[PDB]
Design a protein around this nucleic acid. Structure first.
Lengths: 98, 48, 138, 41, 154, 180, 128
RNA sequence: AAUUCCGAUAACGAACGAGAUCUUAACCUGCUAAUUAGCGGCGAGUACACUGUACUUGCUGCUUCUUAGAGGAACAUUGUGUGUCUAACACAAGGAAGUUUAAGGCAACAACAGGUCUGUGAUGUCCUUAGAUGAACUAGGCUGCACGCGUGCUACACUGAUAUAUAUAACGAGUAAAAUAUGCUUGCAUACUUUUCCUCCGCCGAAAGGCGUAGGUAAUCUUUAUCAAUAUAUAUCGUGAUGGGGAUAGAUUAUUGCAAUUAUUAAUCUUGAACGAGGAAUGCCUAGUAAGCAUGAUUCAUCAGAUUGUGCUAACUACGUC
């Protein structure tokens, strides 16, 4: 499965739980693939109006993507994943024969 | 009526209906002052 | 056999591959001289002149340079050759000989061994520069 | 103001100084004599 | 000048083993001498790109452009016209307004590419998307590169 | 063994006011084949001493408005300037530079009563005076910069009124002597 | 030899021929350069080595240059809106035509003509 | 650096602030990991040598480098000086790093009748409400100009312009309207296609630009082992308001839009002003900074000389004083 989130710690918890879950059952996972972090950055003027000094603040929305390819029956791995997630982690299907 | 589907009068803030100061980056469609009230719960946190 | 290492000055990175060979040195697909500025050319030849021509005659060297501008690449290459020669002698040739070689390079300059870590100070609002400001007036 | 013309150290300035010539004409003299800046003969 | 003492072993087996300019000038001169590729006549009245904002003012430039393009093709084996336009781009003083780089004129580029292709030097394919270098050209470029390397060296 | 541009030997010097030799510091670990070494020179006050005297000359020469950051052209101009020096007069250029610094620096100056000039400062001032003299000469003036820089170095090495640097030093030294 | 005066002054003569040619009209330089190549007076020489025949050829090329290979788009003073169609019209005749066009504008009337008659720039400088 | 500590001390004890915390950037784990990243392994050619090197299609251990998780690493460590020799500083060494490693972010108490009701369906009162200060449509105008003041841009040339060549960057950013057929009559109405964002690529176009297509909802395609300009090299001028300077104007064909005239923007030819380094004054700045050079993003139907990011080219001068 492919895991996309805006909570690092939540993704990490999901990563460990599916890793343990799979390793019981001898399943073939290709070790946690961490994708380059994308940040959505917004550069915002402070003050709703002009007056006072020009003062800016720089906002960052950092999104985490992580990837695991897996060879098994879908249903058990998705069921293990789906119940174990917190909803802040968005789960997407990926599957292989080897 | 005679609206246009382009240019300044075509669009307005999703929250407050101001025509000015709208963030269309990432298709947010919110004015920046309104955006400051919402900026933590949306996820656009400050850091550096 | 083969060792691989790097050099890093500013945003440049230069990977050095030091293999068993004959004294052939390339930079991407292209021979070592073909890097352009004559002044900075001498800087990249500099480790060869500190170590004489015999040591490279047993070894072929391949280099891959990515990123950074002109000055940055030259230093990264110079650094990578340094790091390459010394690391190869630690895995393959002899630690005492390597220590002697390292001493020669260190005695000349530490910049060859370890890159300068200077990098940009971010731009901050209120002026075009990193610290520089718009002109104030009364 | 120019007062240098067509007819009668190998730097262009030296030639211009010695013979009172414009620098393109100084260059022309250099080329004739021999038979941006770079190594000398 | 061109020769200097060397502290490592040169290979002389490819265009990648010889400096761009000497190879380019000689190949351009050879190409014009042979007369394989035309001037063509209309090409003298136009500029290389808008960053020039002037006549090209150097006579033999078309052969040079072809020569550089051919070298770029060995360097990067799959490219199209846009790559050339971007390559030969330079800065344009916009008068009072700031500089920007501005792309090279695409007809002259398109014509050179087409003439080379007609003469078996370069090849439009779907297996690799744009123009690549092709076999008569590859052999010729390699051999001419050797011929020059030896002739220059000693 | 090592040589500047493969051209200039750098194994020989004169002793100057003794202070200046210690400051300029031409010695094996300060030797390099070419100008352009960008090591940390603003670490502490004294650190400028360890910065090679040729390196210092190139950095100073590069300085002024439109010409800033164009360091390789400035280096090219010094290399050509030494080559010009070698032909124009009978000495090794490295030696000619040592002579120019030994003559060139002003030794006394006034802020409020003249006071003595520190030797590191004296070296910097001399390098600045030589380069500023070259710049004053260069602008709109037909003769090329490599030659103009070469003329300042030889004239300063000689000691002459055909050097700005000596003239400026004379001006500084006289005002200080007069004031005090 | 040197120090020539043609239709207008051209005293250039230690100076290169092409820049000497610019000194009339075609100070935009491309027009002068194409005319020089088409005339086939050679750019290499100084202007004191011009032949009189070569100068006459330049006048011949300059006169209606559609008939050589010089492109129609490249040519100045094109459509010149009328029943006819025109070419670049040179020197005092060019000034006379420009003056003529301004005279026509004053009679015609629209804002650019009116601003021009008044003494005020075409696009505005923002005089505030 | 600091009502930071020490020390003295009719106070002792506290608390907030500050440090600290947090985000980057700086170095090491031959541990943690391999996809849409690399590296090899290995088939296969094309090219040259010569008992390998360069270049392309097909299959597929390694993880140094690409990425990113966890974790380590500096505390002034050691040595030497100065210091009530107390808090501590100074120098040298070691060290990836020694100004709390560099940069940010965060912002006490109490204020200012500072700014904002032209951001808000946050909002009082007062005004107004069909010859409206609501909603809405057409023009005009915010840019006009004897003239005064700001911030920027572009210059005054030869360490340069002009023209060819060569090298090489980082952050990024990207999807109820269009078009074909039918019914009525090119107008209107309905269906169907697949339409609006990035454009590779192939053709056509001097150029702008066009047409045809292809992949991309993105570490995958635009595009990145290379997208910039200053670089640098070779030529051409040759110091002369000059080929510097590009204001100004004149003529064009394009492109966006319902609408381009007060020239939206674009190219093309022609047109060739002031300006010779700036008075009195006054601004910014201490190391990858200053300066110079670009460029991404924001607005955007169309419009960067703006702002905000990001890099490359890498100086001067200290390293202090009231």
């Amino acid at each position: 499965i492919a895991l996309t989130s805006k909570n690092l710690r939540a993704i990490e918890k999901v990563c460990s739980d599916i890793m343990k879950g799979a390793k019981e059952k001898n399943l073939n996972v290709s070790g946690p693939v961490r994708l380059p972090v994308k940040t959505l950055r917004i550069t915002t003027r402070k003050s709703p109006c002009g007056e006072g000094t020009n003062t800016w603040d720089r906002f960052e929305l950092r999104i985490y993507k992580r990837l695991i390819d897996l060879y098994s029956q879908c249903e058990v791995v998705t069921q293990m994943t789906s119940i174990n997630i917190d909803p802040v982690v968005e789960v997407e299907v990926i599957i292989t024969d080897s | 009526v005679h609206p246009k589907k382009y240019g300044q009068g075509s669009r307005q803030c999703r929250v407050c209906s101001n025509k000015h100061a709208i963030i269309r980056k990432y298709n947010i469609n919110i004015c920046r002052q309104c955006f400051r009230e919402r900026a933590d719960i949306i996820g656009f946190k400050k850091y550096r | 056999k083969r060792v691989q290492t790097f050099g890093k000055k500013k945003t440049a990175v230069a990977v050095a591959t030091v293999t068993n060979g004959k004294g052939l040195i390339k930079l991407n697909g292209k021979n070592l001289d073909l890097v352009e500025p004559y002044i900075l050319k001498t800087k990249v030849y500099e480790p060869l002149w500190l170590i004489g021509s015999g040591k490279l005659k047993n070894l072929d060297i391949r280099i891959r340079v990515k990123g950074g501008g002109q000055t940055s690449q030259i230093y990264a290459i110079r650094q990578a050759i340094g790091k390459g020669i010394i690391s190869y002698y630690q895995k393959y040739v002899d630690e005492s000989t390597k220590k002697e070689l390292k001493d020669v390079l260190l005695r000349y300059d530490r910049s060859l061994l370890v890159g300068d870590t200077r990098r940009c100070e971010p731009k901050k609002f209120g002026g075009k520069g990193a610290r520089a400001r718009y002109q104030k007036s009364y | 103001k120019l007062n240098h013309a067509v007819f009668i150290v190998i730097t262009p300035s030296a030639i211009a100084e010695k013979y009172k010539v414009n620098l393109s004409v100084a260059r022309a003299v250099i080329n004739h004599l021999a038979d941006s800046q770079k190594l000398y003969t | 000048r061109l020769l200097e003492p060397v502290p490592f072993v040169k290979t002389n087996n490819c265009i990648k083993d010889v400096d761009a300019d000497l190879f380019i000038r000689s190949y351009a001169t050879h190409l014009k001498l042979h007369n394989k590729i035309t001037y063509p006549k209309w090409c003298t009245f136009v500029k290389t790109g808008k960053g020039r904002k002037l006549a090209p003012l150097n006579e033999d430039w078309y052969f040079i452009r072809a020569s550089s393009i051919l070298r770029r093709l060995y360097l990067h084996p799959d490219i199209g016209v846009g790559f050339l336009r971007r390559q030969f781009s330079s800065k344009q003083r916009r008068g009072v307004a700031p500089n920007h780089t501005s792309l090279a004129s695409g007809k002259i580029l398109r014509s050179i590419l087409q003439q080379l292709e007609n003469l078996g030097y370069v090849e439009q394919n779907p297996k690799k998307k744009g123009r690549r270098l092709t076999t008569k050209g590859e052999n010729a470029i390699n051999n001419f590169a050797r011929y020059i390397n030896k002739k220059v060296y000693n | 063994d090592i040589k500047l541009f493969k051209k200039w030997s750098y194994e020989e010097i004169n002793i100057a006011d003794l202070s200046l030799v210690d400051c300029i510091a031409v010695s094996q670990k300060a030797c390099v084949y070419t100008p352009h070494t960008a090591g940390r020179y603003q670490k502490k006050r004294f650190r400028k001493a360890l910065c090679p005297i040729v390196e210092r000359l190139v950095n100073s020469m590069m300085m002024h408005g439109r010409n800033n950051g164009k360091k390789l052209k400035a280096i090219r101009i010094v290399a050509y300037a030494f080559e010009i020096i070698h032909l124009m007069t009978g000495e090794n250029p490295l030696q000619v530079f040592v002579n120019a610094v030994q003559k060139g620096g002003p030794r006394e100056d006034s802020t409020r009563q003249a006071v003595d000039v520190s030797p590191l400062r004296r070296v910097n001032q001399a390098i600045y005076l030589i380069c500023t003299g070259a710049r004053n000469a260069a602008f709109r003036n037909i003769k090329s910069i490599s030659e103009c820089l070469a003329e300042e170095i030889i004239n300063c090495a000689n000691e002459s009124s055909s050097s700005y640097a000596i003239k400026k030093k004379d001006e500084i030294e006289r005002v200080a002597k007069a004031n005090r | 030899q040197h120090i020539l005066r043609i239709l207008n002054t051209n005293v250039d003569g230690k100076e290169k021929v092409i820049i000497a040619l610019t000194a009339i009209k075609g100070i935009g330089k491309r027009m002068a350069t194409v005319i020089c190549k088409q005339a086939n007076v050679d750019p290499t020489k100084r202007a004191g080595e011009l032949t009189t025949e070569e100068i006459d050829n330049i006048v011949h090329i300059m006169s209606t240059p559609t008939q050589f290979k010089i492109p129609d788009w490249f040519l100045n003073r094109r459509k010149d809106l009328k029943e006819g169609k025109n070419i670049h019209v040179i020197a005092n005749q060019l000034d006379s035509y420009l003056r003529e066009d301004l005279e026509r504008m004053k009679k015609i009337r629209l804002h650019r003509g009116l601003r021009h008659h008044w003494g005020l720039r075409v696009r505005g400088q923002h005089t505030k």
